[PDB]
Amino acid sequence: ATAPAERCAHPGADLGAAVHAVGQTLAAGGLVPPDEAGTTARHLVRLAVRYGNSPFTPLEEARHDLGVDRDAFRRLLALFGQVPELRTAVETGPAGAYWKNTLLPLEQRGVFDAALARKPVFPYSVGLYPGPTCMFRCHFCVRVTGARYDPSALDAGNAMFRSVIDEIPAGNPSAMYFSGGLEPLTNPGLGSLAAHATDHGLRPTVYTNSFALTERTLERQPGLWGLHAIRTSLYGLNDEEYEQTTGKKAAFRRVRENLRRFQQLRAERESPINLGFAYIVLPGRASRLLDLVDFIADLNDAGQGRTIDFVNIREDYSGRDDGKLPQEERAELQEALNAFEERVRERTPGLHIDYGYALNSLRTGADAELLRIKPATMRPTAHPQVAVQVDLLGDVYLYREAGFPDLDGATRYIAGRVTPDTSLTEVVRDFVERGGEVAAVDGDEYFMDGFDQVVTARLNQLERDAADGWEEARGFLRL
Amino acid sequence: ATAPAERCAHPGADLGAAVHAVGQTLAAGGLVPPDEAGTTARHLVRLAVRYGNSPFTPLEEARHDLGVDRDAFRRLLALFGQVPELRTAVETGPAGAYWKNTLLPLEQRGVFDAALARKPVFPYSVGLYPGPTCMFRCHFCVRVTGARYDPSALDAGNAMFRSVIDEIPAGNPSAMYFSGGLEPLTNPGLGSLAAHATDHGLRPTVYTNSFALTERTLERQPGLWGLHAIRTSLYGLNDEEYEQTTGKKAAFRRVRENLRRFQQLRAERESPINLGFAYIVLPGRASRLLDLVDFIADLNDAGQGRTIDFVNIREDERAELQEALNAFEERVRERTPGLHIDYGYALNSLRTGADAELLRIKPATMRPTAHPQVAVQVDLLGDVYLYREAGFPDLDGATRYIAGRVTPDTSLTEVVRDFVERGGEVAAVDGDEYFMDGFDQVVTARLNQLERDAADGWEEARGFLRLEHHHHHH
Amino acid sequence: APAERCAHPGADLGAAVHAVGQTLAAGGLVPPDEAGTTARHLVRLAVRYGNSPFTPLEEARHDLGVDRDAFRRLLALFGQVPELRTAVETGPAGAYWKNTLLPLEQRGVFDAALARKPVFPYSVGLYPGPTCMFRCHFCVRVTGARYDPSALDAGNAMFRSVIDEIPAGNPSAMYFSGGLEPLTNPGLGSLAAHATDHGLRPTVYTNSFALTERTLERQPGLWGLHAIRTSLYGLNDEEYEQTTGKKAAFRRVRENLRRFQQLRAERESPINLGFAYIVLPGRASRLLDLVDFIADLNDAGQGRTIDFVNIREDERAELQEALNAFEERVRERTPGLHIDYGYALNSLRTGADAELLRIKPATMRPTAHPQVAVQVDLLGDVYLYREAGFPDLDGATRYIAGRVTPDTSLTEVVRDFVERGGEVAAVDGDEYFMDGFDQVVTARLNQLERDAADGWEEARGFLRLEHHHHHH
Amino acid sequence: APAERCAHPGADLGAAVHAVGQTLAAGGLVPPDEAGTTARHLVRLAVRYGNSPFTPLEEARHDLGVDRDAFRRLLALFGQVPELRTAVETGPAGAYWKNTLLPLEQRGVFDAALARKPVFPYSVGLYPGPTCMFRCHFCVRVTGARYDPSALDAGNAMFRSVIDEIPAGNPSAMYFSGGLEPLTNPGLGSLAAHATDHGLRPTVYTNSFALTERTLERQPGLWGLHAIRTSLYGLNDEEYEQTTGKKAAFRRVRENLRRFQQLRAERESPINLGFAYIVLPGRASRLLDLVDFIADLNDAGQGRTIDFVNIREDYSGRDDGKLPQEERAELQEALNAFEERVRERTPGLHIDYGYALNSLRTGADAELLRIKPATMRPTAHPQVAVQVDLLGDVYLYREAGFPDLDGATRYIAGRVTPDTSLTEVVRDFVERGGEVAAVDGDEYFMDGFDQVVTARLNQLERDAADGWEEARGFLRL
Ligand SMILES: C[S@+](CC[C@H](N)C(=O)[O-])C[C@H]1O[C@@H](n2cnc3c(N)ncnc32)[C@H](O)[C@@H]1O
Ligand SMILES: C[S@@+](CC[C@H](N)C(=O)[O-])C[C@H]1O[C@@H](n2cnc3c(N)ncnc32)[C@H](O)[C@@H]1O
Ligand code: MET
Ligand code: MET
Ligand code: SF4
Ligand code: SF4
Ligand code: SF4
Ligand code: SF4
Ligand code: NA
């Protein structure tokens, strides 16, 4: 039971019932004289349909589609702000994951403004890549087989990591995270890094494959119990699936036993740490969502009522065909996702689910694919105000999928190196002040993760709107 | 077609219909065996009514009102978190202005957590008080007649403000605001401070009486145009009303012509700056709200279609006052349809006819550590005041609430960190309670409630309702 | 439950719309974006039929403003929200649905009248009294009119032949009432015993003025009746003379009933005792004195109490709490007394602003409803409406469907009239021939005939049947 | 009101006695000192008859320990506390009172059988199917036994004359069920249309295996029925094969019902559609899946939904149909989740429970009656119910009307022929006092309804023989 105007962006929505409800809101509120309430309510609903599906549409394109004067578009933008049901229709429409998860949270904190003005500010999201190696060979990962960091570089690297954590301003508990190009649990001092950050006032999350998340590892790295959460990347639901995805035999059994035992130890400790999973839906595995619930239910039985906290249903953001789901399987995801939610409430009620940008559109039946930024649409200054990444050697990478050792072309996206004489603040500040740029060549676009590609499309939308004279109204929705 | 479970906190609400809806939500979710769905729903609804009207109620007092034992209260709280219509009843109840405007936003940002834990944190809300002087003498204001800052403080104070602005971390463009004890526009370098803050990535609001917001000031201080908003404290609707409030003659005509001309320049410059007004409704004169709409309508005519953005309405007869705000809203829709309205905490509850329960912190209920993690204020001398109304020169007893002084050798970050880390405290004496503005009293009432709940063994459930940080994982 | 209460005055209609909106959405009955608009139409239907049960479906559709196909969908969706059917059956007009319309629809009583088919009447009134000793100012009986005393035996044999015609399946299909007073027939006890032997359990409706011990000895078969309901025309001698025109009539009636209470307990007779009482405008405080009247009767029956009362009607918040006081004093003084109100009085409780039906000549159905109810007087004349069976009543003979004779049964009187399409064109004043039941049956048949002609043959009457398969 | 629910398990008996005692004292029915002990006796009676409706009055008096003068006053006092009658009728045994006992006393049906008088049967079952294609393990039909196909013409003419005999006043007094499957009679639609023109509203009780589109095409009079109730024997192909013996039986029954849903919505037929569903051993956890089956049929109906579901058990008590004590105890919880699942997904679906199943919700353990040869009435109850098969044979019990069932012929009251009507068959058997001596096995000729009527007529005859003729059956109204 929902209001018509709040659902007016999803497929098959009664646009007439929405224009009527909006028109009454404008008339009753005195915003539009009653004789024109119907006309403008149609323009307003059309704007909400568009940005509820394509959040990056430049304002001039939306005005052209309305076939309307600039002054009358300015009035519609102001009028749009007075109709809260249409804002809801955008934020909760098919493309609503864009608005609620990334666009609006970053806009409100001024992060997009700092990058839009090319001003030297501390990065809003600092990624620390502490892992020297990895024991998986995932077909969708850009890491180069065999490439590793020097084992004799761990001590100086972990000392460098502590100094970077000293720079992280408090007030945002999720400002820093431990992830990687490689696998962070292969760093023996990751628990020490976690302790140094929690002692700093941060609540970081570790993103791992959990192959090394053994009970012996928890004993030698007790600081991991102080993290906010551990998100395990889940690459399959049996050994044959894990071997297809990661190339490693018997990998599923050991990852599962590690989380079964971790669930046991979390109960006995009554630790506030959260446990979640990232589950990329891979080609030929859309029918496996039902079995994913059984995997989580199995993990809940080992936790003595302590539940798995969240699950991130995701997609290969690279777009390469080894990860891209065919349209045939894309068409079956609406039924699959809705049935997956039903089973969760049956067997795993307390588990939080959230979907990728395109997956969230597929439920309710709006076809959508993830962005695929090309070198022509890459911003040569990157966005260090939004995010940077630091690996073991102190190198500060401009995009998430560029921080891999011995990756071709990846060194060109190093803004600098954090040394005992140079801080991350100084590396980012000097790269912004001197206007450092990197020209994009073919293949560079694959250094960008899903977040980097969304941040790029947003900054491109804002620069174009400001260039089109819509400086204040840039991005359609903001404050 | 509203849900009665989302409305049960307002007066005259059908509580019977609320317990039926909640009981069905409990039965449908399998949260209670069907025998106790009635008793559990009446308890849960009683909790929603209580906290929808009295948000600071200690959990133990609510439990004693319910008549249930400690263990039953624990599972009642866990069930409350599974009846979302009841959270809405609290959030949108008569006291909903507390929850949605202050309590829950600050809880989500970890602001109350930091003060509760006595963590050395950079203050969430930093007020800069740059005015050396005021030309008004408002009878309600605590400023001391004959008191002002020396002109010799201007240069070093403005450079001090610049260094403090540089200290403010990224992530909240509203972290800093320009207000005062005294009048901010009397600082000739206020526009430069605004430009310095704008370059920093901040979007600051100035709170002023706008008497000095002349064209001469705008040309002397063009950096004011980059502010996010100017909220003018409107002390009346004609000269005689303005003279009884402020003691100055012909002050309404000056403020009005200033705002008429600003509207004109704002339209010509196409400035995105916002314009708002704070108006206090006096006893028995709630009809003057209609004249307020006419005042803004006249301002909207000077702006060539570019209108006034918001109005803050505060108080300081029940059904009458309810009638008068309803008339105020009707005429807004008729004359100023886009004007945003938000009421004070007590006034927001008097709409709906609920009894405005007064918040009067006394010296006994003041927290000796204050709350520098939430808010501090800096005047021209670099003095960091712990409460908003303590930052006035020569104010009796007010220097006792200086946490420290920002100097070229001591930053604001150090002043706050040292005061918190050493456990600095100020023992309250009679009269200190007037140093707290409305915000200080709500923050103190919340921190007293949180501390009482934790001491009572309800640490996780402290404050009844709370938001957490939203950790989204990509 | 707000959705179950939405038909009552001052109900929270917004809460009902939300509740029914959830049911449609959660059940997949309606897309959630239009669950609110459908819910408002469904609640409006429930409010209408919970207050005006006879509204034709086309009238309800026109007030909703939806087309024919949309109304059909709304009627089907309405059958999916059990709380709304409850709102209709327990609304201000719920007594119509629960006490008359739905039970008769279940038994197929209306269907025979709709199809114009010959069946034996569902309700057969026998009027065996030749005279009456009262002259009630409200009664339509003609002063100076009575039945020939030579009509008795001949008519009593006719009555016995009519009793023999009554089929099995409804032991209360026949009752003894009248135009005039039944107890003035010396053979009424014999007719009662004849019906008891037939397997029937009849009730007699009487003013009980002639319910003397002498009458009991002359007509001992009266003890075999299922129940005796006395028409109570007052609570002291003055009121009874005011109503009936007879002096010291209350003294006689109370004397008879207290005597009957003693005799009933000595015989350990299972016969039930009831009373009909009319509350007069503004005098609803006399309901408390009625409880005193019943209590004194109880004290005369040694632990054998009066079984039921029928309270019916002639600002009204003086009435609303007059009935709460009456209801409470019953629990204090006569806790076993079954209370039943009329249609209007039942709606006046709950504060609803509803009247009784007032059928006019233009809305009377020319065929009448012999399949539902007929009445036979001492001459064998079969009357089509209850208040037409009075000798010499002006215009009443036009509503005689036929006469039961040794050569013509009641079954044949009703069959010939129906099959030949017999009709009576209503003239001004004929509407007084219909009692309250006749007006309800007329109003329901008009509604059912209208709905069927409009193309709503299956939804006719809005509410009709249930699902019974417990004997499989 | 604690007195209105004093018959269910977990009731505050002390509070109910307290409230009944004040009713007794306030109303002046009993002196105030004895108001407490009398209220306990009255509450004990309501608890007893709200759980065991067939208890002889002399057994209840012995349980109370009083004598006949006290019992007589207690019966009279019981009628003066209306909340105690509500506690009986809405107690765990309330399905007996509200569905069968009290409605049939109201119609004088029980009095007709009690007085051994010739009245037309209250319930007339027509058994028109010559064969069946299912082999349900709980049915008493014999594998392979069939009716001669050449008997259909004379049988369908006989059925038409029996329908002509049905009296008005009860439009559902006749039904099409059977021993065998009624849809295997090619003239069932004609018999249906014949009764519809008679003014009846009959129901066909079928396994719906033969409810195909071609069958509706050939038997259009089926669309004029009041309702079709499909006996549901499983929720997938495996469950159906386990129960009926036939493979691919569920998918064909479901397809027939899906297509019937499309046909019902196309012509907007008034016909109702419901289901009978026996809770079989090992399947008490399947009630939630039953709602999924119903919603699937609702999706095929385009807004026109399933009207009702009857939840039943094996009324024979045999091992293969009787639910073990363990699984039966799980039924209280299973029913509650079932009803909450119906309320969410199929809110218009009417639900009703068998006699014992209705007691299991609210936690009262009860079993269906198991009549034995010693408690069988030799005259049976033709005034209450009879059944007629293809050959015109009038069977006295529902489960005796099967071809070539051993000993079933001993319970034929007569044969309807062009010379002899059902009325005369029942009249002659009643007027001559026909009786059938019960031999071991005859009790399995009685269905659930038969056993309830027998137990009621035994209780009524026992009460009268004990001198409680007027108070017979405790409740009667
Ligand atoms: C690869 S690093 C994590 C370090 C650790 N070895 C692991 O796999 O969890 C960051 C995250 O990016 C995800 N990821 C890597 N390549 C991806 C791709 N092409 N599409 C979507 N997610 C990808 C991984 O699943 C992991 O959760
Ligand atoms: C004998 S069948 C004949 C009608 C048709 N063949 C059918 O299955 O519905 C009549 C009804 O009795 C039911 N029945 C047969 N044996 C039963 C038993 N032992 N317990 C409960 N019901 C039974 C069947 O399920 C069916 O609904
Ligand atoms: C708290 S006193 C300062 C108020 C401010 N100077 C004004 O007049 O708006
Ligand atoms: C309907 S005429 C009245 C019949 C009966 N003699 C009475 O007084 O009630
Ligand atoms: S995604 Fe993680 S586990 Fe997989 S190959 Fe890359 S670094 Fe290793
Ligand atoms: S309230 Fe503001 S304007 Fe008034 S005297 Fe105080 S400082 Fe001056
Ligand atoms: S109402 Fe009855 S008692 Fe009165 S005059 Fe008429 S027939 Fe006689
Ligand atoms: S119950 Fe019906 S379908 Fe099953 S075997 Fe018996 S006759 Fe056949
Ligand atoms: Na007297």
Residue numbers in the entry:
A (entry chain A): 8 to 486
B (entry chain B): 8 to 323, 336 to 493
C (entry chain D): 10 to 323, 336 to 493
D (entry chain C): 10 to 486
From the paper:
Like other radical SAM enzymes, the catalytic cycle of DesII is characterized by initial single electron transfer from a reduced, active site [Fe4S4]+ cluster to SAM. Each monomeric unit comprises three domains: an N‐terminal domain of six α‐helices, a central radical SAM (RS) domain, and a C‐terminal domain consisting of a β‐hairpin and two α‐helices. The RS domain (residues S132–L369) coordinates the single [Fe4S4] cluster via residues C141, C145, and C148, which make up the CX3CX2C motif.
The present work reports the 2.33 Å crystal structure of DesII as a binary complex with SAM bound in the active site. The crystal structure of DesII from Streptomyces venezuelae was determined by single anomalous diffraction using a selenomethionine derivative. A single molecule of SAM was found coordinated to the [Fe4S4] cluster in chains a and c with methionine bound in the active sites of chains b and d. The GGE motif (G187–E190) interacts with the Met moiety of SAM via H‐bonding interactions. In contrast, the R238, S240, and Y242 residues at the end of the β 4 strand H‐bond with the SAM ribose moiety to form the “ribose motif” originally described in BioB. The GXIXGXXE motif provides hydrophobic contacts to the adenine ring of SAM, which is further stabilized by backbone interactions with a polar residue in α 5 and hydrophobic interactions with Y324 as found in other radical SAM enzymes.
